[PDB]
Amino acid sequence: LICAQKFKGLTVLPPLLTDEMIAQYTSALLAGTIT
Amino acid sequence: NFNGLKGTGVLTESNKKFLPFQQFGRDIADTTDAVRDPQTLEILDITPC
Numbered sequence: 681l682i683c684a685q686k687f688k689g690l691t692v693l694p695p696l697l698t699d700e701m702i703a704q705y706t707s708a709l710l711a712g713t714i715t
Numbered sequence: 716n717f718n719g720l721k722g723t724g725v726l727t728e729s730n731k732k733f734l735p736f737q738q739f740g741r742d743i744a745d746t747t748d749a750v751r752d753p754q755t756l757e758i759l760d761i762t763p764c
């Protein structure tokens with residue numbers, strides 16, 4: 681409940697780049713450096 | 716205001732297990748989050764507005 685006790689004005693905002701897009705960039709760099 | 720338990724917010728219904736001698740409820744931030752009504756014997760939870 682340590683994550684849900686944020687009633688006292690302490691917010692965490694998500695990153696703009698999600699995990700899927702980061703993994704897709706990683707796959708793109710891997711493909712570009714292998715082929 | 717239940718015997719000096721002043722606060723601001725809504726009082727939702729909570730059904731957590733307590734003890735007969737335990738009526739107060741605090742949290743990590745040392746704030747009154749769960750309370751027991753003095754007259755009637757159910758449990759309320761303070762949620763901000």
Ligand SMILES: *[C@@H]1O[C@H](CO)[C@@H](O[C@@H]2O[C@H](CO)[C@@H](O)[C@H](O)[C@H]2NC(C)=O)[C@H](O)[C@H]1NC(C)=O
Pocket residue numbers: 754755756
């Ligand atoms: C507070 O006092 C009142 C009388 O002034 C009592 O409440 C009654 O409790 C009985 C329980 O057997 C109920 O059947 C009645 O309907 C209640 N009357 C009311 C609420 O007017 C009792 O002594 C105390 N009540 C509580 C909830 O502690």
